[PDB]
């Protein structure tokens with residue numbers, strides 16, 4: 001009858017108990033120091049469910065766990081209305097260049113300068129690098145691009161050679177705002193200021209930093225008219241073509257559980273969201289399920305809704321094939337010595 005949520009960390013736990021109070025014991029709590037550990041608890045059946053990102057889903061899918069509800073995020077386009085009925089699409093990981101540099105295509109990237117949001121980031125790293133392994137067949141992506149700015153790698157690396165830090169020699173290649181070329185924005189600036197030949201960002205990154213949308217000096221005089229997406233065809237389409245010229249769709253996070261206790265979770269959550277969701281009965285009142293004393297506890301903070309999925313998809317399908325191609329190959333290069 002009860003659903004046991006698994007909290008990764010002492011603060012998720014703190015929230016999970018409030019949830020349990022308000023829910024009048026309909027949702028109780030397990031907890032673990034790691035996510036992989038919470039996954040396990042779901043397998044062992046010591047905990048029922050928890051929300052996971054593209055990558056953890058895979059992990060858990062492979063261990064035979066199942067997506068249940070996606071986590072839809074507030075957006076520019078999303079109707080925002082009756083979102084519970086289906087998932088929204090989620091970021092389009094795109095490769096971006098300037099129109100100038102004609103030679104550049106998804107095929108001719110070897111030994112170019114690269115700009116990454118940060119290491120281990122989905123659109124900035126996992127997706128693009130994952131699909132380059134698919135090309136090269138090899139795992140030596142550390143040495144694919146001549147030099148790069150990938151915040152979070154070793155400052156000594158060539159993967160950090162392009163990163164600028166605070167421009168006073170400090171905080172080179174760190175995954176913070178302190179690193180000049182960090183983030184979607186920073187990777188895009190990395191491109192704009194001709195430090196790098198390709199930037200791996202998302203659709204909007206381009207738009208929201210062109211044609212007046214950004215007041216930053218490097219951004220003032222930037223026209224979408226001057227940048228191209230790279231498609232997997234090796235075709236260079238305009239910036240407006242993200243929809244059919246992306247690398248992959250960043251997966252929406254997803255609530256996950258065993259099939260044997262899948263539809264129960266589903267049924268129990270939709271109610272808890274009605275009580276505690278963005279505009280549920282008791283949200284401004286007793287407990288908001290998508291607000292966090294810290295940030296992103298149990299659920300990302302900017303969660304519109306948990307969404308009924310489209311039938312009964314396997315993780316392979318829920319994640320999209322492009323993404324798995326990637327995470328797979330980075331999971332093969334990962335765990336290389338067996």
Ligand SMILES: *[C@@H]1O[C@H](CO)[C@@H](O[C@@H]2O[C@H](CO)[C@@H](O[C@@H]3O[C@H](CO[C@H]4O[C@H](CO)[C@@H](O)[C@H](O)[C@@H]4O)[C@@H](O)[C@H](O[C@H]4O[C@H](CO)[C@@H](O)[C@H](O)[C@@H]4O[C@H]4O[C@H](CO)[C@@H](O)[C@H](O)[C@@H]4O)[C@@H]3O)[C@H](O)[C@H]2NC(C)=O)[C@H](O)[C@H]1NC(C)=O
Pocket residue numbers: 076077078079080092203204205207208213240241242243
């Ligand atoms: C790739 O990335 C880009 C960048 O994010 C993205 O473009 C954005 O698309 C959205 C949706 O098409 C645009 O949103 C609309 O913007 C207007 C206001 O526009 C101005 O102000 C913004 C900044 O605040 C500027 O960026 C923009 O250039 C304009 O100057 C809003 O009024 C719209 O509101 C609607 O939001 C929802 C949209 O589905 C709905 O809730 C509803 O339609 C809202 O509006 C209206 O509906 C009522 C019924 O018709 C009507 O009666 C009401 O009066 C009301 O008008 C909406 O937010 C956004 O501006 C774009 N941003 C940029 C920078 O271009 C692409 O969509 C994305 N595409 C791909 C390829 O993935």
Ligand SMILES: *[C@@H]1O[C@H](CO)[C@@H](O[C@@H]2O[C@H](CO)[C@@H](O[C@@H]3O[C@H](CO[C@H]4O[C@H](CO)[C@@H](O)[C@H](O)[C@@H]4O)[C@@H](O)[C@H](O[C@H]4O[C@H](CO)[C@@H](O)[C@H](O)[C@@H]4O)[C@@H]3O)[C@H](O)[C@H]2NC(C)=O)[C@H](O)[C@H]1NC(C)=O
Pocket residue numbers: 022023024026271272275
């Ligand atoms: C934790 O999970 C439990 C179990 O799912 C939730 O319990 C439900 O709580 C609601 C509200 O307290 C219950 O709903 C109401 O029950 C009334 C009487 O109960 C009988 O009839 C309903 C069906 O009508 C049966 O489901 C139930 O077993 C009983 O036989 C009903 O009269 C109400 O329905 C009528 O009036 C409303 C309002 O006008 C109409 O909208 C309806 O169409 C209908 O005419 C209503 O169903 C519900 O039955 C409970 N389930 C149980 C115990 O079986 C907890 O809410 C949840 N807790 C939290 C905080 O998350």
Ligand SMILES: *[C@@H]1O[C@H](CO)[C@@H](O)[C@H](O)[C@H]1NC(C)=O
Pocket residue numbers: 134135321322325
């Ligand atoms: C690379 O990616 C595409 C799309 O995932 C796939 O169809 C193709 O066969 C892959 N190539 C190799 C050699 O795996």
